[PDB]
């Protein structure tokens, strides 16, 4: 059901069927037809290259499981991982092309992509009266750091939510309104908020997104202890005091996607560095060989590059069978401890859709 189990499960044959699928109606009208077409493809493929008994057994096992599917609660892709024994049915957001892969292992490259796309971060919400802190992973709020968080127990700074109970906000103080110390007081309040954020970050380091009015964001920026840890600043999020934590998370999504895009833009420079050092392979067969013998450190794939090839394992040659040679290379790189990065089609040219930064 998870990427771990799918990658660690072996079968013969193992069938991965990926069906293009829609969230809304009437777009989801074709999801039953698309699934049925994709199942016809695999039925005839299995009957052709294994036998009628294997084909009918696998297709019966997956039919019994896809009969329940509502098709009204579809995500943006429906993946089916079938063997003669077990059948797993997952709905992935991301994307994929309608394809049938039959091999000794499941086509888990799209799950690898989704896993490699994940970002875990803090969201510091600032107003002139209060600060909030939300821990987040992609689209969802992990925790909102209230008194019930139990990670604020040994806090030496003010724990979240930090209300601005400064002297000028209540009226005891010194230097009444004629002094015009509001900016200095608000600067120090955001400095203390930053102190709390840094205290909580020093145990669970991960980047922060600063959310709030443009003036508050900037006052915070010229006060933050580690301003180079800030990945994004969102100044058009609404109802920052009473709003839902999930609402804040939904607000920061354009910034988070921009940060992912910037991460790929940066990986461009890593490829150039490897090319200069002559430790980069871009030929498909060379990439396969280096990935197979554990020499691959970082694989870069054009996000949709799918090539079928006549892979020979013992002879260690690749010619153009395995329907996902790129997927097999991804699996080898992940297995031998390397990383996989799926770059957008405009960061990576269609001339060179794959690039392995090798270990030596």
């Amino acid at each position: 059901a998870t990427l771990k189990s799918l990658r660690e499960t072996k079968a013969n044959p193992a069938v991965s069927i990926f069906v293009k699928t829609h969230r809304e109606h009437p777009a989801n009208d074709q999801d039953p037809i698309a699934l049925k077409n994709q199942l016809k493809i695999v039925e005839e493929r299995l009957t052709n290259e294994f036998d009628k008994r294997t084909a009918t057994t696998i297709l019966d096992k997956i039919h019994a499981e896809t009969k329940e599917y509502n098709h009204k609660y579809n995500l943006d892709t429906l993946a089916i991982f079938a063997s003669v024994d077990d059948v797993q049915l997952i709905r992935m957001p991301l994307d994929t092309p309608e394809r049938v892969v039959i091999s000794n292992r499941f086509a888990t490259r799209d799950l690898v992509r989704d896993m490699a796309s994940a970002v875990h971060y803090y969201t510091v919400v600032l107003t002139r009266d209060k600060a909030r802190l939300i821990e987040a992973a992609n689209d969802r709020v992990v925790a909102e750091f209230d008194t019930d968080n139990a990670k604020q127990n040994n806090m030496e700074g003010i724990p979240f939510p930090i209300d601005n109970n400064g002297l000028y906000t209540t009226g005891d103080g010194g230097s009444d309104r004629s002094a015009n110390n509001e900016n200095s007081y608000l600067k120090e309040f955001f400095n203390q908020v930053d102190k709390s954020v840094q205290e909580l970050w020093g145990e669970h380091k991960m980047p922060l997104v600063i959310v709030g009015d443009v003036r508050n964001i900037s006052y915070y920026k010229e006060v933050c202890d580690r301003p180079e840890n800030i990945i994004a600043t969102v100044s058009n999020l609404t109802e920052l005091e009473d709003g839902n934590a999930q609402r804040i998370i939904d607000g920061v999504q354009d910034a988070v996607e921009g940060y992912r895009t910037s991460l790929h833009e940066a990986a461009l420079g890593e490829i150039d560095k490897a090319r200069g050092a002559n430790a980069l392979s871009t030929d498909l067969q060379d990439v396969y060989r280096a990935a197979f013998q554990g020499a691959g450190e970082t694989l870069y794939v054009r996000r949709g590059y799918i090539q079928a090839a006549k892979v020979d394992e013992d002879a260690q040659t690749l010619t153009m069978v395995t329907d996902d040679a790129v997927g097999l290379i991804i699996e080898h790189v992940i297995n031998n401890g390397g990383k996989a990065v799926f770059m957008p089609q405009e960061m990576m040219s269609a001339d060179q859709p794959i690039a392995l930064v090798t270990r030596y």
Partner: protein, 184 residues
Amino acid sequence: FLMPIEDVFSISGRGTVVTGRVESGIVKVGDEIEIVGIRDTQKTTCTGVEMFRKLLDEGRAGENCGVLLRGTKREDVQRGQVLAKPGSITPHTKFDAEVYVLSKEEGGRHTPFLNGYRPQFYFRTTDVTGAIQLQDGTEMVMPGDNVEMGVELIHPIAMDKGLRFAIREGGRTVGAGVVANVNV
């Protein structure tokens, strides 16, 4: 006569002009010439030779004359093909080459040339993906060696026995070759 095509444009009332360094031979107004390479061979005739916005008497070897064509619609000619004397030079895709693999001191790669390698081949003014095919007894070519290999380009390229090309991967030179035989 041969001239690789670098730039293609069209002038109203005059026709398609193909610019390029004339490699050899002579071209003058009225000469019949064929456009050989990438696509299928097509004949045509010369109507104008000009450079620096002035008409020239005839384009000779070395000079950068841009020759004008008759009836070519500027889409049947592209960067990479050669303007050649008819009959001379045939568009090939399978050719044997005496390829020397660069070492790591002249650029080159740290890994050998192995059968099934697909680098880009630059001949005169274009690069085309190829398919190195070593003969029997050779499985890989050590960086620094030189050997005869067969190449199956992805589209035809006009070549003759003795033309020098360069091999490249990722924009850096991985070897230099000279054609020794052209097969069909």
